Amino acid sequence: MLDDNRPMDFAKDKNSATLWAKKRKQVWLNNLSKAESTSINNYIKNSSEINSYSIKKKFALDNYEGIETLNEDLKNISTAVKKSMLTKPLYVYYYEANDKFGFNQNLESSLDSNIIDEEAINNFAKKISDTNFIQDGFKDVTMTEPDINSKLPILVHLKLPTNTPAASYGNDEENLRVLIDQGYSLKATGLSIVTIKGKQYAKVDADLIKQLNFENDVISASQWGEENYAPWLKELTSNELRDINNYLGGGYTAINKYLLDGTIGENTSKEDLEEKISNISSALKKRKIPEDIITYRRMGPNEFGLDLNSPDYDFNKVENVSKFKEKWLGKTIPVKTFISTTVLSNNISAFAKRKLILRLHLPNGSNAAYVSVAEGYKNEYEVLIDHGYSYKIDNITEYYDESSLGGKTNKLIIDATLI
Ligand SMILES: NC(=O)C1=CN([C@@H]2O[C@H](COP(=O)(O)OP(=O)(O)OC[C@H]3O[C@@H](n4cnc5c(N)ncnc54)[C@H](O)[C@@H]3O)[C@@H](O)[C@H]2O)C=CC1
């Protein structure tokens, strides 16, 4: 009933927005447990901290103890907002920075700050296409088109679909916000210029979408792998099973080295390497990825032309992160190797100090397989991708890995799309 008297979009009608928000906010708060009420209050005070913590937690090693009251806040805010699901779509609004679209060109004209640069917004149009922008943490937004200046260049007009957990909350009863649950992504649906208080903003129309992304959920991940690739495993030829297992047991070193630049160990031959590559690649064409999925990879510095001791690889310094972002944002990188990925975001002990974390949109139809169906229960939840694809670099987002075992260093989350 709480959506019976409202449009999908309040537009500029703040009075109708407030009437709607006040009623559902009251119902919602009374349905919260004490723990949920506390965590929502914690979000009002410490939202930046909670959202930043959620990133550290999802990319940490398994033995990460973390901060127990923030662990509680992550759980309780999520169960809280799930008590307030929309019954019809709701359009929402927020100003946004360049960085959240992986865009590093100024959209302001050089000659007039009120005016958007035509060439920049043309490049922006290409950059936001063909991309699902993962939204980390919880996202809070406003109900009406802002009537105030922003230092930010972009206005997002975001369509939340029916059944989105989206709770009315906040301390200003006349400007109540909307708190969106974790786990969503943004998909642009249109681009235009909007003028607000005499100044032009790039207006991104977008849908809120939910991509399959297991993060730390080992139970769901292994179930998905079993369901979708147990038959794949049984139908492998003997050689395909053999050379898949060779690769996964340590043959990757020689196989991917050869695919990268033709290196041949002394005791092997080109023809034996070609054979293994042919059987693995044939196996990976047998069952295309059945739905869009996010997978992960702890990447070594050579995958971006860097060496372990390169000064440019020290992301603890600001200028190196800026250099890396300038070099790779928006680029397409061909990948000659097979790509070993995992459906879990957890850091991996053998790779704990690698500083580059691939977060890969792996499309429906990709030649890849959940290969861990073959191993025993000590497995790494792996999706192996065929050689010869490319990465489209969508975003680069730093976070600080404080852990001794992680290397006490900034690391870069590289959001990419497989092409
Ligand atoms: N790295 C990861 O996140 C995951 C790896 N595994 C498994 O661990 C084992 C070893 O994994 P990796 O060390 O990652 O094998 P790998 O052959 O991909 O990489 C080994 C070394 O070669 C570099 N390298 C790989 N591809 C490159 C490319 N196109 N260009 C330049 N340098 C490249 C890497 O940075 C690394 O230093 C495999 O069985 C693999 O399936 C399992 C879960 C995910």
How many whole angstroms separate alpha carbon 105 and alpha carbon 316?
24
Buried b (16+ CB within 10 A) or exposed e, 230-267: eebbeebeeebbebbebbbeebbebbbebbeeeeeeee
Domains, the chain, in order of start with CATH, read 1-212 (3.90.176.10), 213-419 (3.90.176.10)
- Residue with CA nearest ligand 1 atom 36: 300
Angle of CA points 170, 97, 108, to nearest 5°: 130
Cα 195 to ligand 1 centroid, rounded to whole Å? 48
Sheet containing 139-141: order of strands: 139-141, 177-180, 166-169
Residue in the block written with tokens 């992986």:
102
Resolution in Å, one decimal, please: 1.8
Q: Alpha-carbon distance 274 to 264, whole Å?
A: 11
> How far from 245 is each of 164, 236, 251, 374, 384, CA to CA, in Å?
42, 11, 8, 8, 12
Report CA-CA distances (Å) from 101 to 104, 132, 208: 9, 10, 15
Q: Where are the alpha helices (DSSP H) in 32-117?
A: 34-58, 68-81
Query: Is 337 known as a binding-site position?
Result: yes
Neighbours of 89 (CB within 10 A): 17
Amino acid at 134: I
In short, whether 386's Cβ falls inside 6 Å of ligand 1 is: no
C-beta separation of 185 from 133 below 8 A? yes
Alpha-carbon gap, residue 157 to 144, rounded angstroms: 9
Q: Residue 317: which region, alpha, beta or left (left: phi > 0; alpha: psi -120 to 50)?
A: beta
Query: If you measure from the C-alpha of residue 240 to the centroid of ligand 1, how many angstroms do you get, rounded to a whole number?
Result: 20
Judge if the beta carbon of residue 335 lies within 6 A of ligand 1: yes
Tokens representing 385 are 């991708």
Residue nearest (by alpha carbon) to ligand 1 atom 28: 303
Q: Is 303 annotated as a binding residue?
A: yes
Decide: 211 and 134 in contact? Cβ < 8 Å.
yes
Q: Which of 358, 232, 334 is nearest to 290 (CA)?
A: 232
Kind plus residue range of the DSSP H or E element containing 53: helix 34-58
Picking from 100, 90, 92, the residue whose alpha carbon sits closest to that of residue 154 is: 100
The finding on whether 185 has its CB within 6 A of some atom of ligand 1 is: no
Ligand 1 centroid to Cα of residue 352, in Å, is: 13
- Report how far residue 339's alpha carbon sits from residue 281's, in angstroms, rounded to the nearest whole number: 11
Whether the Cβ atoms of residue 411 and residue 357 lie closer than 8 Å to each other: yes
What stretch of H or E contains 201? strand 199-209
375 is in an annotated binding site: no
* Centroid of ligand 1 to alpha carbon of 125 (angstroms): 34
Helix, strand, coil percentages (3-state) for the chain, rounded to 5, are 35, 25, 40
At position 49, the amino acid (one-letter code) is E
Which of 236, 250, 12 minimizes the C-alpha distance to 143?
A: 12
| Closest ligand 1 atom, residue 348 Cα | 3
Give the C-alpha separation, 155 to 97, whole Å: 9
- Rounded to an integer, what distance in angstroms lies between the CA atom of residue 376 and that of residue 385? 21
Instruction: Assess contact for 292 and 363: CB atoms under 8 A.
Output: yes
Distance 340 CA to ligand 1 centre (A): 6
- Least Cα distance to 248 among 214, 280, 295 occurs for 280
Structure tokens at 326: 């300038």
d(CA 320, CA 40): 37
Does 342 sit in the ligand 1 pocket, CB within 6 Å? yes
Rounded Cα gap, residues 127 and 123, in angstroms: 6
Ligand 1 centroid to Cα of residue 299, in Å, is: 7
